[PDB]
Every structure is written in C-alpha cells, then in structure tokens.
Design a protein around this ligand. Structure first.
Ligand code: COH
Ligand code: COH
Ligand SMILES: [Cl-]
Ligand SMILES: [Cl-]
Lengths: 110, 110
C-alpha cells in the first residue's frame, strides 16, 4: 500500500513568506490523526513577484488525509485563517491557495 | 541554516508514470552524500494528458545537494538517462524535466 502526499500551495504577497511560515510552528491537532507521518513547510527559491509557501503532508494513505480533512482539528487549525480575497481578509498576505495530491511510489529515509 | 529540498519534475507521456517510478527503486549512491536525508518519488493525481512524476530530495543544507550534483555518483546514476528529444532517446517517455529548490522553514515527523 502506498503512502500519500498532500500539498497546499500558498501564493503570497512579496516578502510575506517568513511571517507566514512562522504561523505553522505550533501544532493544532494534526499529530493526533491516525496515519499522519510528516509535515514540511517550504519557501520556493526563485525571482518571482510573489512569494510561494508550500505545506506538504505525508500520510500512510489517502484515506488518512481525508479523515483529517473531515476532522474537527482541521477546522480548529483553520478557524482564523483568511485569504486576501475574503470579505474580512484585509490583513492577509495570502492571495490564493491551491491543493495538489500525490501517490508516493517510493520513499527512502537515512 | 535550514534544511533544504530539491525537486526534479518529470513531464512524462501519458501512461508511463509506473515504469518511470520503478527506475528509482535501485539506489545509485545519493545516500552516501553527507547531508542527504530523504528521497520521495511521487505521481501527481490529476486529469491532465501527460503524467507527472516528482523526485523530492531532502538535505541538511543546499551545499550538500550541490555536492551531490557535482559528484561521481550523480553522473553514474544518470549516465543512461535520455529525454525523448535526444538523438538516441526516441523510446524514452520523459518529455522534459524542471528543477525546483526550496528552503525548508519547518519540519515535523511523528
Ligand atoms: C492539503 C492540506 C491543507 C489544506 C487543504 C489547507 C487549507 C488552507 C487554506 C485554504 C483553504 C489556507 C489559506 C491555509 C493556511 C493555513 N493553514 Co492550512 N491547509 C492544509 C495544510 C495545513 C496543515 C497540515 C496545517 C497545520 C495543522 C495542525 O494541526 O498543526 C495548516 C494550518 C494552516 C495555517 C497556520 C495556522 C494558523 O494560522 O492558525 C495557515 C495560515 N494547514 N490552509
Ligand atoms: C534535483 C535533483 C535531480 C536532478 C537535477 C536530476 C536530473 C535528471 C534529469 C535531467 C537531465 C532526468 C531526465 C532525470 C531522470 C532520472 N533520474 Co534524476 N535527477 C535528480 C534526482 C534524482 C535522484 C535523487 C535519482 C536517484 C539517485 C540515486 O543515487 O539513487 C535520480 C535518478 C534518475 C533516474 C533513474 C535512474 C536510472 O534510470 O538509471 C531517472 C530516469 N535522479 N534526472
Ligand atoms: Cl496550509
Ligand atoms: Cl529525477
């Protein structure tokens, strides 16, 4: 059975990557979900006009991720999150997000 | 100083993801580079008319990744690799590749 990866890709106002990444330091319940394995928060290195921050989560299965998506802890973690496009999103540097999903065909860990 | 991620993104002809992923099962020395931590090989779940396979490598530093790029094992691992557009690559299902680089601002493993 294959592991699974979900990515949330955040398009951010230029210069806002660091303040955004720091919002992820404190866990808000994902660690309680059966099948959750790893989380990475990355800044893309490039010369673009907007920053890019990605949240990669690694799971035992896609079903495990879907259970998290349906969970109270997902909703809790995202309670106060806004997009710049939201009616009350004036202070948000997050222009948009897009979700990508992946089957993991192979993994090696030293 | 942060962990570092490099991605090689393979654009593949439709239906060739599995045969391409299986080429990565056999280690060819990347694991011997100081600073190498993890490798993932993923198939993107989408409805597009090309397959997409991503090779994600996780490192203690960007320096260690560059050291691997410059190594004899990188060259040996890739010596027989061709793109379809190469003179001797007609049967290769690999259409193109693109490299992406990321600073890891946060990591968690359960
Ligand atoms: C693919 C998975 C996924 C999705 C769909 C998603 C949906 C969205 C989304 C648009 C719907 C936006 C704008 C954000 C933005 C954020 N998410 Co997520 N997030 C996701 C993965 C995560 C993860 C993982 C965490 C940490 C959860 C925890 O329990 O620690 C998170 C928490 C956050 C945080 C930090 C917590 C806070 O500020 O209180 C921000 C900012 N976000 N996320
Ligand atoms: C960003 C990192 C990176 C780059 C730039 C890169 C450059 C390229 C590239 C562009 C010319 C192409 C078409 C490929 C395609 C392949 N690479 Co890489 N590869 C990379 C990460 C990897 C990794 C990691 C392995 C396994 C190495 C090992 O030692 O096990 C690999 C090995 C392979 C293999 C399987 C080994 C084999 O069939 O013998 C294919 C196919 N490839 N790679
Ligand atoms: Cl997120
Ligand atoms: Cl590759």
């Amino acid at each position: 059975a294959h592991m699974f990866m979900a990515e949330n890709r955040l398009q951010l106002q230029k210069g806002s990557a660091e303040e955004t990444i720091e919002r992820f330091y404190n866990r808000q319940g994902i660690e309680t979900i059966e099948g959750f394995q790893q989380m990475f928060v990355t800044k893309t290195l490039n010369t673009e006009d907007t920053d890019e921050v990605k949240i990669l989560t690694i799971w035992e299965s896609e079903d495990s991720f879907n259970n998290w998506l349906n969970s109270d802890v997902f909703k809790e973690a995202h309670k106060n999150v806004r997009l710049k496009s939201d009616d009350d999103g004036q202070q948000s540097p997050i222009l948009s997000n897009k979700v990508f999903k992946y089957d993991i065909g192979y993994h090696y860990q030293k």
